[PDB]
Design a protein around this ligand. Structure first.
Ligand code: ADP
Ligand code: ADP
Ligand code: MG
Ligand code: MG
Lengths: 469, 475
């Protein structure tokens, strides 16, 4: 529940003029800018690199859910969503009564001579993409750029800017209306589910109710996600589903975004605008794509491996693309799983062979999708579009448990055990592969103990001098 | 559809008097003033200059479609369109019925001595707007036609007056399609379905021209506009002569005014006969009779103020304006495109001023496909210009999207990413990654770069202290 008190902003567009709903909205520039700037990452100090394997594995398993890097498509989707929300409200001006009547009035005023100039001046969407591409998370982050509920004191309008409905696994069209009321309740503090969402009602009545409630709480955008989950058998076949969605758009009267997979596009082939959420491309315009390189370089810094390689090889990045094929779940999944297996086996360095072992063993269920993308054949890609890696969370727990069962110790882990203060161990890990640990650690401890006041930044050159003299 | 119930007006002309189709039309001064006076554009404040490059670039890419400066050829075309539409209705007055019978009756009156003065005579004007692609013909046509209501309903006569109909030819065009698309366009303006009923692939062009005539006179059509004549395939339509016949026949079978918009290469179809009237949408000329053209000066100065750059050149220089004309050669698409693309290049490069070198750089990198035509315009050779008159820069909107995406990437680059790209060697990046936590980026990257620039072949191990020494205190 996100409520805010409305502040009306002077726009530069005549259609938006004196429209409280658009004026209360954040500026289009902000929503476009915030799409580029609003990223989430992890707080990794060098101390976290020194910690135990269980602790570091727990931290690694959080990259899947606490790391977000914006890309080019995110800005495009943000502008599209903002244009939808503002455009959906251009017709709904409470004071601008009639659109056609103003045309006649202006034509009359021109014919009389009151006006010396006048201009006779004179929608849903479908986000289709493979699973793991990043549709749902991108939607969540883009919607965080807006206030979900904006209250206007000048009236009693409780504006609900955005509402997202996810679809149940093996779901039905019946459940979408009920979940609409549920989501509005959870995002507004109301209890429409108890009253309107009752089994006695039919879909038609619930559709009208959805329309009325969305017009009372003027709905900028309605998001229905994971429509791939909707069961064709229960929903009544591809056409029926299609018909429902079409009708649902006209009744509610708000812009509607449907998010699904290329297989769910088979439902809509009898007809909505379609924007595609394609996987990351390594070669763009006959040239290496810098977005892929930037994303992999940023993700590389979330690497809690002691014998790690700080610089990303072209080899490792390109095998990463080969296995992942640009779908962003399998990118992050491959990174995390490779780090876990490295923790398990020692050899805490990511190689192409380690990535290949992870791909061969832990990512078998999504292979038919990936190879389909490798083939470029649209039918195969559509067929395997819904494929995901089941029970990945339990598997991450299992691999972390395997790490915990390890009674062995790496040489670097031993050396960190011998040294005591974090700064000492930081100096070690910084220089541990350019010098032999056996002669490295004693000099570090001697220098640190003999200069308690001296800063670690000042102590590093001293240890360097002693090492080379 | 823009459907309006007629409100009649008193025009001062006797010939226009009590003619519903002209009286319901908006006044001539309004139509001429409306296109000229309306110069609506983006309003930019000093605050907007001091803003993020993403949002500034967003505003910059909106200049192409939100900037319109009315110019002389536009105003002449507006007046001519108004005169054409109004003039074409004088012989179509509903009151002046049984025109030939009146003639007979008038004759009879004269032949009885009742009438001492009568005149026997038997006004579908035609226009050919010839200009290079990118001059601004379509935008001017759209803005002129937006000052008019497309459909006016006459309650007394039960007649749906279609003021204007615009047909856009396809990239490989047949004179068939034009005919068909007529109906399609009408079916969009009215509620009709003439395409489903009358106009089908089965019927021939000659039959469909007669159907066009019948339906255009039922819904009295002030103006038929066929735009992008250049796109028509001369091998698919049967040759220049046949094509010409079509238009001539169309102007004579249909009693409505017709406007054809095309390139200098499409004039070759009509060059056999100077009929058709010709308006030439020449590019903006730098000099007028040996002295500067204030049209060029005004257009460039007005567009120059729509500049979201911090260290902007306070006012447009003669050097920069002369380079701007040299590259663009007066074609308004290239002017605005060069301006916008150069602003996006300045934002991407981090600079906040427009240089002549920047304009030349964008011209050479981005506007390659149109280079022949522009060069031809420098030569002044008519045939050479006509050959390349149809040239259009392709996919510039996707390139604007790519440019502002690249601008977005540099803005949101992490300080680590900026440093790793500024370091030229793997060793330097390894050193930066080692020392990033306890040392500041201001000295760290330059110190490493100069340390490797003065000891070119030297190991990382030996060069770590030298970088450290200069950071603590060193040469
Ligand atoms: N911008 C991003 N940066 C980093 N990781 C991402 C990003 N977008 C998505 N991911 C990863 O992809 C995973 C799956 O994304 P999800 O929203 O489920 O896509 P879809 O809905 O298409 O299956 C997320 O758990 C997240 O870890
Ligand atoms: N009067 C004008 N002021 C500003 N820009 C213009 C003007 N006329 C045309 N343009 C620019 O030229 C571009 C294309 O013009 P267009 O109408 O297609 O010319 P043509 O029909 O000759 O190709 C448009 O994107 C528009 O931005
Ligand atoms: Mg999904
Ligand atoms: Mg054109």
């Amino acid at each position: 529940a996100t409520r805010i008190q409305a502040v009306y902003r002077d726009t530069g567009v005549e259609a938006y003029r004196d429209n409280p709903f658009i004026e209360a909205l954040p500026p289009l520039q902000e929503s476009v800018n915030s799409a580029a700037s609003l990223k989430s990452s992890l707080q990794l100090t060098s101390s976290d690199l020194q910690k135990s394997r269980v602790i570091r594995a727990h931290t690694i398993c959080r990259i899947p859910d606490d790391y977000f890097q914006p890309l080019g498509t995110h800005l495009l989707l943000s502008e599209r969503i903002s244009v939808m929300i503002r455009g959906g409200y251009v017709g709904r001006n409470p004071k601008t009564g009639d659109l056609q009547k103003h045309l006649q009035n202006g034509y009359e005023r021109v014919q009389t001579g009151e006006l010396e100039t006048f201009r006779f001046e004179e929608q849903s969407l479908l986000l289709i993409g493979c699973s793991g591409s990043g549709k749902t998370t991108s939607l969540h982050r883009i919607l965080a750029t807006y206030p979900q509920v904006i209250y206007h004191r000048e009236l009693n309008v409780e504006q609900v800017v955005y509402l997202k409905i996810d679809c149940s696994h093996n779901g039905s069209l019946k459940e979408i209306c009920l979940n609409f009321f549920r989501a509005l309740d959870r995002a507004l503090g109301s209890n429409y589910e108890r009253r309107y969402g009752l089994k006695r009602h039919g879909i038609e009545t619930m559709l009208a109710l959805m329309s009325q409630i969305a017009n009372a709480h003027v709905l900028g955008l309605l998001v229905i996600d994971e429509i791939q989950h909707l069961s064709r058998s229960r929903s009544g076949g591809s056409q029926e589903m299609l018909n429902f969605f079409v009708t649902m758009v006209n009744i509610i009267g708000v812009p509607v975004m449907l998010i699904g997979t290329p297989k769910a596009r088979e439902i809509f082939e009898a007809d909505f605008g379609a924007i595609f959420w394609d996987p990351i491309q390594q070669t763009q315009r006959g040239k290496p794509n810098q977005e892929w390189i930037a994303f992999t370089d940023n993700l590389w810094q979330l690497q809690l491996l002691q014998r790690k390689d700080a610089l990303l090889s072209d080899e490792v990045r390109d095998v990463w693309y080969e296995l992942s094929q640009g779908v962003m779940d399998i990118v992050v999944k491959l990174f995390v799983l490779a780090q876990l297996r490295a923790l398990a086996l020692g050899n805490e360095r990511i190689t192409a062979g380690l990535l290949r072992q992870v791909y061969q063993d832990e990512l078998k269920p999504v292979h038919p999708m990936l190879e389909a993308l490798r083939s470029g054949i649209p039918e195969r890609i559509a067929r395997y579009s819904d494929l995901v890696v089941p029970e990945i969370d339990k598997r991450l727990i299992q691999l972390q448990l395997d790490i915990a069962a390890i009674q062995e110790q790496t040489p670097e882990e031993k050396a960190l055990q011998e040294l005591d203060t974090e700064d000492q161990r930081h100096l070690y890990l910084m220089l541990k592969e350019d010098y032999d640990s056996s002669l490295l650690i004693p000099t570090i401890k001697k220098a640190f103990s003999q200069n308690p006041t001296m800063t670690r930044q000042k102590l590093l050159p001293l240890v360097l001098q002693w090492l080379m003299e």
